[PDB]
Amino acid sequence: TFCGETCRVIPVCTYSAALGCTCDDRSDGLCKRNGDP
Secondary structure, X not given: OOXXXXXXXXXXXXXXXXXXXXXXXXXXXXXEOOOOO
């Protein structure tokens, strides 16, 4: 539920990706966390 970064027109936040955080992506949105994404 919001990892930390955000996926714009270049999604898949790579910093938070270490956790396996995944964004929803809709041209823009918000990267989600893990455990409680």
